[PDB]
mmCIF file of N, CA, C and O in Angstrom:
data_model
loop_
_atom_site.group_PDB
_atom_site.id
_atom_site.type_symbol
_atom_site.label_atom_id
_atom_site.label_comp_id
_atom_site.label_asym_id
_atom_site.label_seq_id
_atom_site.Cartn_x
_atom_site.Cartn_y
_atom_site.Cartn_z
ATOM 1 N N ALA A 1 97.870 108.645 95.595
ATOM 2 C CA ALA A 1 96.767 108.852 96.525
ATOM 3 C C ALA A 1 95.539 109.402 95.807
ATOM 4 O O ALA A 1 95.585 110.479 95.213
ATOM 5 N N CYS A 2 94.442 108.654 95.865
ATOM 6 C CA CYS A 2 93.201 109.067 95.219
ATOM 7 C C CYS A 2 92.292 109.797 96.204
ATOM 8 O O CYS A 2 92.559 109.826 97.406
ATOM 9 N N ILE A 3 91.219 110.385 95.686
ATOM 10 C CA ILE A 3 90.272 111.115 96.519
ATOM 11 C C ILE A 3 89.270 110.166 97.170
ATOM 12 O O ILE A 3 88.586 109.391 96.501
ATOM 13 N N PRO A 4 89.180 110.229 98.507
ATOM 14 C CA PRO A 4 88.262 109.385 99.279
ATOM 15 C C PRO A 4 86.802 109.768 99.064
ATOM 16 O O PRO A 4 86.501 110.872 98.611
ATOM 17 N N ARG A 5 85.899 108.849 99.392
ATOM 18 C CA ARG A 5 84.471 109.091 99.232
ATOM 19 C C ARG A 5 83.996 110.185 100.184
ATOM 20 O O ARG A 5 84.344 110.190 101.365
ATOM 21 N N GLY A 6 83.199 111.113 99.662
ATOM 22 C CA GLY A 6 82.690 112.199 100.478
ATOM 23 C C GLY A 6 83.509 113.466 100.332
ATOM 24 O O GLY A 6 83.054 114.551 100.692
ATOM 25 N N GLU A 7 84.721 113.328 99.804
ATOM 26 C CA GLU A 7 85.607 114.471 99.615
ATOM 27 C C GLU A 7 85.375 115.119 98.253
ATOM 28 O O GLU A 7 85.066 114.439 97.275
ATOM 29 N N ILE A 8 85.524 116.439 98.200
ATOM 30 C CA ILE A 8 85.330 117.179 96.960
ATOM 31 C C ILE A 8 86.422 116.849 95.947
ATOM 32 O O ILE A 8 87.579 116.638 96.310
ATOM 33 N N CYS A 9 86.045 116.804 94.673
ATOM 34 C CA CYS A 9 86.990 116.501 93.606
ATOM 35 C C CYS A 9 86.770 117.419 92.406
ATOM 36 O O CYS A 9 85.637 117.776 92.082
ATOM 37 N N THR A 10 87.862 117.798 91.751
ATOM 38 C CA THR A 10 87.791 118.675 90.589
ATOM 39 C C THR A 10 87.818 117.874 89.292
ATOM 40 O O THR A 10 86.971 118.059 88.418
ATOM 41 N N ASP A 11 88.794 116.981 89.174
ATOM 42 C CA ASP A 11 88.931 116.150 87.985
ATOM 43 C C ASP A 11 88.189 114.828 88.158
ATOM 44 O O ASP A 11 87.895 114.411 89.279
ATOM 45 N N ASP A 12 87.888 114.174 87.042
ATOM 46 C CA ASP A 12 87.180 112.899 87.069
ATOM 47 C C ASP A 12 88.127 111.759 87.429
ATOM 48 O O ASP A 12 87.800 110.901 88.250
ATOM 49 N N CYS A 13 89.303 111.755 86.811
ATOM 50 C CA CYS A 13 90.298 110.720 87.065
ATOM 51 C C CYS A 13 90.944 110.911 88.434
ATOM 52 O O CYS A 13 91.710 110.064 88.892
ATOM 53 N N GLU A 14 90.628 112.028 89.081
ATOM 54 C CA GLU A 14 91.178 112.329 90.397
ATOM 55 C C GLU A 14 90.614 111.382 91.453
ATOM 56 O O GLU A 14 91.294 111.033 92.418
ATOM 57 N N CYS A 15 89.365 110.968 91.262
ATOM 58 C CA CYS A 15 88.708 110.062 92.196
ATOM 59 C C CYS A 15 89.353 108.680 92.158
ATOM 60 O O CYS A 15 90.075 108.345 91.219
ATOM 61 N N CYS A 16 89.087 107.881 93.186
ATOM 62 C CA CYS A 16 89.640 106.536 93.272
ATOM 63 C C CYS A 16 89.218 105.695 92.070
ATOM 64 O O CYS A 16 88.624 106.206 91.121
ATOM 65 N N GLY A 17 89.531 104.404 92.117
ATOM 66 C CA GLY A 17 89.177 103.514 91.027
ATOM 67 C C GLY A 17 87.684 103.486 90.763
ATOM 68 O O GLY A 17 86.941 104.326 91.269
ATOM 69 N N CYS A 18 87.245 102.516 89.968
ATOM 70 C CA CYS A 18 85.831 102.382 89.636
ATOM 71 C C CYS A 18 84.966 102.486 90.888
ATOM 72 O O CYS A 18 83.840 102.983 90.838
ATOM 73 N N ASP A 19 85.498 102.013 92.009
ATOM 74 C CA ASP A 19 84.776 102.054 93.275
ATOM 75 C C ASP A 19 84.150 103.427 93.500
ATOM 76 O O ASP A 19 82.972 103.535 93.835
ATOM 77 N N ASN A 20 84.950 104.474 93.315
ATOM 78 C CA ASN A 20 84.474 105.839 93.499
ATOM 79 C C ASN A 20 84.475 106.599 92.176
ATOM 80 O O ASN A 20 85.203 106.247 91.249
ATOM 81 N N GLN A 21 83.656 107.643 92.099
ATOM 82 C CA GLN A 21 83.564 108.452 90.890
ATOM 83 C C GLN A 21 83.331 109.919 91.233
ATOM 84 O O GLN A 21 82.677 110.240 92.226
ATOM 85 N N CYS A 22 83.869 110.809 90.406
ATOM 86 C CA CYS A 22 83.722 112.243 90.622
ATOM 87 C C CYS A 22 82.443 112.762 89.971
ATOM 88 O O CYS A 22 82.454 113.208 88.824
ATOM 89 N N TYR A 23 81.342 112.701 90.712
ATOM 90 C CA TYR A 23 80.055 113.163 90.208
ATOM 91 C C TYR A 23 79.847 114.642 90.518
ATOM 92 O O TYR A 23 80.332 115.151 91.530
ATOM 93 N N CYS A 24 79.122 115.327 89.640
ATOM 94 C CA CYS A 24 78.849 116.748 89.817
ATOM 95 C C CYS A 24 77.347 117.020 89.799
ATOM 96 O O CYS A 24 76.803 117.580 88.848
ATOM 97 N N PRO A 25 76.659 116.612 90.877
ATOM 98 C CA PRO A 25 75.212 116.800 91.009
ATOM 99 C C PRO A 25 74.833 118.265 91.201
ATOM 100 O O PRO A 25 75.664 119.107 91.541
ATOM 101 N N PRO A 26 73.547 118.578 90.978
ATOM 102 C CA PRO A 26 73.029 119.943 91.120
ATOM 103 C C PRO A 26 72.990 120.399 92.574
ATOM 104 O O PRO A 26 73.316 119.636 93.483
ATOM 105 N N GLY A 27 72.589 121.648 92.787
ATOM 106 C CA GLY A 27 72.515 122.184 94.134
ATOM 107 C C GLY A 27 73.873 122.272 94.799
ATOM 108 O O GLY A 27 74.123 121.609 95.806
ATOM 109 N N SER A 28 74.756 123.091 94.235
ATOM 110 C CA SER A 28 76.099 123.258 94.777
ATOM 111 C C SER A 28 76.120 124.339 95.853
ATOM 112 O O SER A 28 76.848 124.233 96.840
ATOM 113 N N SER A 29 75.316 125.379 95.654
ATOM 114 C CA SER A 29 75.245 126.482 96.605
ATOM 115 C C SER A 29 74.121 126.257 97.613
ATOM 116 O O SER A 29 74.185 126.734 98.748
ATOM 117 N N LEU A 30 73.094 125.529 97.192
ATOM 118 C CA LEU A 30 71.954 125.240 98.056
ATOM 119 C C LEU A 30 72.178 123.950 98.838
ATOM 120 O O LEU A 30 71.618 123.762 99.917
ATOM 121 N N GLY A 31 73.003 123.065 98.287
ATOM 122 C CA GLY A 31 73.287 121.805 98.947
ATOM 123 C C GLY A 31 74.453 121.905 99.911
ATOM 124 O O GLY A 31 74.459 122.753 100.803
ATOM 125 N N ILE A 32 75.442 121.036 99.732
ATOM 126 C CA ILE A 32 76.619 121.030 100.593
ATOM 127 C C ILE A 32 77.894 121.240 99.783
ATOM 128 O O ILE A 32 78.814 121.930 100.222
ATOM 129 N N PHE A 33 77.940 120.642 98.597
ATOM 130 C CA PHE A 33 79.102 120.763 97.724
ATOM 131 C C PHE A 33 78.694 120.661 96.258
ATOM 132 O O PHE A 33 77.523 120.450 95.940
ATOM 133 N N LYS A 34 79.667 120.813 95.367
ATOM 134 C CA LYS A 34 79.413 120.738 93.934
ATOM 135 C C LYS A 34 79.673 119.330 93.408
ATOM 136 O O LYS A 34 78.773 118.675 92.882
ATOM 137 N N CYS A 35 80.911 118.869 93.555
ATOM 138 C CA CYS A 35 81.291 117.538 93.095
ATOM 139 C C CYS A 35 82.059 116.788 94.180
ATOM 140 O O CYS A 35 82.884 117.369 94.885
ATOM 141 N N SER A 36 81.783 115.494 94.306
ATOM 142 C CA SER A 36 82.445 114.664 95.305
ATOM 143 C C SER A 36 82.541 113.218 94.833
ATOM 144 O O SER A 36 81.940 112.838 93.828
ATOM 145 N N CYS A 37 83.304 112.413 95.566
ATOM 146 C CA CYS A 37 83.482 111.006 95.223
ATOM 147 C C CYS A 37 82.266 110.185 95.644
ATOM 148 O O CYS A 37 81.908 110.146 96.821
ATOM 149 N N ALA A 38 81.636 109.531 94.674
ATOM 150 C CA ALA A 38 80.463 108.710 94.943
ATOM 151 C C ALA A 38 80.638 107.301 94.387
ATOM 152 O O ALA A 38 81.341 107.098 93.395
ATOM 153 N N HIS A 39 79.997 106.331 95.029
ATOM 154 C CA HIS A 39 80.083 104.941 94.597
ATOM 155 C C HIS A 39 79.498 104.769 93.199
ATOM 156 O O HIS A 39 78.281 104.798 93.016
ATOM 157 N N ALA A 40 80.373 104.591 92.214
ATOM 158 C CA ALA A 40 79.943 104.415 90.832
ATOM 159 C C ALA A 40 80.944 103.574 90.049
ATOM 160 O O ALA A 40 81.927 104.093 89.522
ATOM 161 N N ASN A 41 80.690 102.272 89.979
ATOM 162 C CA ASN A 41 81.570 101.358 89.260
ATOM 163 C C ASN A 41 81.277 101.384 87.763
ATOM 164 O O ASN A 41 82.090 101.857 86.968
ATOM 165 N N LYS A 42 80.111 100.871 87.385
ATOM 166 C CA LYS A 42 79.708 100.836 85.984
ATOM 167 C C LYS A 42 79.868 102.209 85.339
ATOM 168 O O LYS A 42 80.174 102.314 84.150
ATOM 169 N N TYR A 43 79.659 103.257 86.127
ATOM 170 C CA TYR A 43 79.778 104.623 85.631
ATOM 171 C C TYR A 43 81.241 104.994 85.406
ATOM 172 O O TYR A 43 81.685 105.158 84.270
ATOM 173 N N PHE A 44 81.986 105.125 86.500
ATOM 174 C CA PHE A 44 83.399 105.478 86.424
ATOM 175 C C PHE A 44 84.127 104.595 85.415
ATOM 176 O O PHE A 44 85.051 105.041 84.734
ATOM 177 N N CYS A 45 83.704 103.338 85.324
ATOM 178 C CA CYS A 45 84.314 102.390 84.400
ATOM 179 C C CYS A 45 84.031 102.782 82.953
ATOM 180 O O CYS A 45 84.947 103.091 82.193
ATOM 181 N N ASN A 46 82.755 102.766 82.581
ATOM 182 C CA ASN A 46 82.351 103.119 81.225
ATOM 183 C C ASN A 46 82.872 104.501 80.844
ATOM 184 O O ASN A 46 83.062 104.801 79.666
ATOM 185 N N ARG A 47 83.100 105.339 81.850
ATOM 186 C CA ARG A 47 83.599 106.690 81.621
ATOM 187 C C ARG A 47 85.107 106.681 81.394
ATOM 188 O O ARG A 47 85.601 107.228 80.408
ATOM 189 N N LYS A 48 85.835 106.059 82.315
ATOM 190 C CA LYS A 48 87.288 105.978 82.217
ATOM 191 C C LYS A 48 87.709 105.325 80.904
ATOM 192 O O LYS A 48 88.527 105.869 80.162
ATOM 193 N N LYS A 49 87.145 104.155 80.622
ATOM 194 C CA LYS A 49 87.458 103.429 79.398
ATOM 195 C C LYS A 49 87.341 104.339 78.180
ATOM 196 O O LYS A 49 88.011 104.129 77.169
ATOM 197 N N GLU A 50 86.485 105.351 78.283
ATOM 198 C CA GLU A 50 86.281 106.294 77.189
ATOM 199 C C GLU A 50 87.227 107.484 77.313
ATOM 200 O O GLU A 50 87.709 108.017 76.312
ATOM 201 N N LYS A 51 87.490 107.898 78.548
ATOM 202 C CA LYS A 51 88.380 109.025 78.805
ATOM 203 C C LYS A 51 89.768 108.541 79.209
ATOM 204 O O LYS A 51 90.685 108.496 78.388
ATOM 205 N N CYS A 52 89.917 108.178 80.479
ATOM 206 C CA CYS A 52 91.193 107.696 80.992
ATOM 207 C C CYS A 52 91.434 106.247 80.579
ATOM 208 O O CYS A 52 91.558 105.361 81.423
ATOM 209 N N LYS A 53 91.501 106.015 79.272
ATOM 210 C CA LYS A 53 91.728 104.675 78.743
ATOM 211 C C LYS A 53 93.217 104.344 78.725
ATOM 212 O O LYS A 53 93.611 103.196 78.932
ATOM 213 N N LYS A 54 94.041 105.357 78.477
ATOM 214 C CA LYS A 54 95.488 105.174 78.435
ATOM 215 C C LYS A 54 96.042 104.894 79.827
ATOM 216 O O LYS A 54 96.751 103.910 80.037
ATOM 217 N N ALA A 55 95.712 105.763 80.777
ATOM 218 C CA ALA A 55 96.174 105.607 82.151
ATOM 219 C C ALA A 55 95.495 104.421 82.826
ATOM 220 O O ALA A 55 94.597 103.800 82.256
#
């Protein structure tokens, strides 16, 4: 079970496939959250291939 879009995530590989990505945008205390699952294919992909390449 992966982390759905809009839900907070701690790890990067914790988020769903390339479809979603664990981004950590600014304004964590002033905004709504710190990191959550966001639509990022090319990102999560280019990232995973570099990090979660084995899994």
